[PDB]
Amino acid sequence: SHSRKFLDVRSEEELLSCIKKETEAGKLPPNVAAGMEELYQNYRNAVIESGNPKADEIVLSNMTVALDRILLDVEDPFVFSSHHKAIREPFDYYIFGQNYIRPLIDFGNSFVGNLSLFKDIEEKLQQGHNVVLISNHQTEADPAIISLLLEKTNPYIAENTIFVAGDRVLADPLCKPFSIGRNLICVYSKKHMFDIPELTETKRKANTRSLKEMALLLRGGSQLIWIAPSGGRDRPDPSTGEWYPAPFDASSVDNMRRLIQHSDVPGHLFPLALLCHDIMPPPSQVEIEIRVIAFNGAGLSVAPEISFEEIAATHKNPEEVREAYSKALFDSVAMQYNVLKTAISGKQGLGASTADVSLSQPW
């Protein structure tokens, strides 16, 4: 039976004592207990540093509920398979991840690129078409960056986007409550497929099942799916420290395009850029060389779909077409990303807008 002791915590001393007690009962592995203490301190620090006047209340509330939900999953892990629908009841995991990430976003220094295209995307969905957002990936909070930035203007996208998500993030005890509250297509990454030879067959069968269910969803129409063809989160250049979208896997863009073609329903792929690594960056040696959670502006942009036909008509074979189409999507993502960068880290705000990227603050 679930220990609800984290919900009785009213102080940092009780928090640490609770962590100790759950570990001593064997209900929390020592490395997970340690990760929980680091998480607490880092979340606390970022919220206090934002200047938020309700910092102490937000931290106590979000962190005691986060620890309770992390322990709940450790006691009996939620099993993810193929398509996962966000859990909204009795405990709304979606709204929990939204409220958990809210205080880390500096909305005054956050921007949306080409807001009107998100309305275009909703129209296409209303026509029964499917839309795939071909994006870069920066943090495990990416779904909340998208949902929070668009919650006022595009609540439909905020609540119904489906994220193609890899096994590494879905297995992490600290991220599980967040993941449970999102719509997902769960896949085993190519990167880790061969790490454990005794699991490869199983992962491949599950990947086929996930693809099959995604194809079935597409046949039904009106699906909005996000996928980062790079797989992983962007990393800073190991020498310069510069962050920008990681290389795409051109086969991943091709596989999505072809599933759309066989679904017999009109489908659209739009290049999407996300800028939020400062809020919850992946670990990196150059960052040590030159904080796991921070308050910072976030950016989100979308640009028109790339003409696949124009590329197929001007390239000599299948491989060259695949590479050029993936590169054209990637080139758009990187272009939008630099405009977001100039607006936020460059401090130009709306003055970073260009002919192709029009910024706004829809909140």
Swiss-Prot record:
Subcellular location: Plastid, Chloroplast stroma
Broadest EC class assigned to this enzyme: transferase
Gene Ontology BP, a term: CDP-diacylglycerol biosynthetic process
Gene: ATS1;2
Protein name from the UniProt record: Glycerol-3-phosphate acyltransferase ATS12, chloroplastic
Family assignment from sequence similarity: Belongs to the GPAT/DAPAT family.
Motif range (HXXXXD motif): 137-142
Functional summary from the UniProt entry: Esterifies the acyl-group from acyl-acyl carrier proteins (acyl-ACPs) to the sn-1 position of glycerol-3-phosphate. The physiological acyl donors in chloroplasts are acyl-ACPs, but acyl-CoAs are used as artificial donor for in vitro reactions. The enzyme from chilling-resistant plants discriminates against non-fluid palmitic acid and selects oleic acid whereas the enzyme from sensitive plants accepts both fatty acids. Squash is chilling-sensitive. Does not seem to discriminate between the acyl-ACP thioesters 18:1-ACP, 18:0-ACP and 16:0-ACP.
Pathway: Phospholipid metabolism; CDP-diacylglycerol biosynthesis; CDP-diacylglycerol from sn-glycerol 3-phosphate: step 1/3
Keyword set, alphabetical order: Acyltransferase, Chloroplast, Lipid biosynthesis, Lipid metabolism, Phospholipid biosynthesis, Phospholipid metabolism, Plastid, Transferase, Transit peptide
GO cellular component terms listed in the entry, alphabetical order: chloroplast stroma
Catalytic function, reaction form: a fatty acyl-[ACP] + sn-glycerol 3-phosphate = a 1-acyl-sn-glycero-3-phosphate + holo-[ACP]; sn-glycerol 3-phosphate + an acyl-CoA = a 1-acyl-sn-glycero-3-phosphate + CoA
Protein EC: 2.3.1.15, 2.3.1.n5
Domain of life: Eukaryota
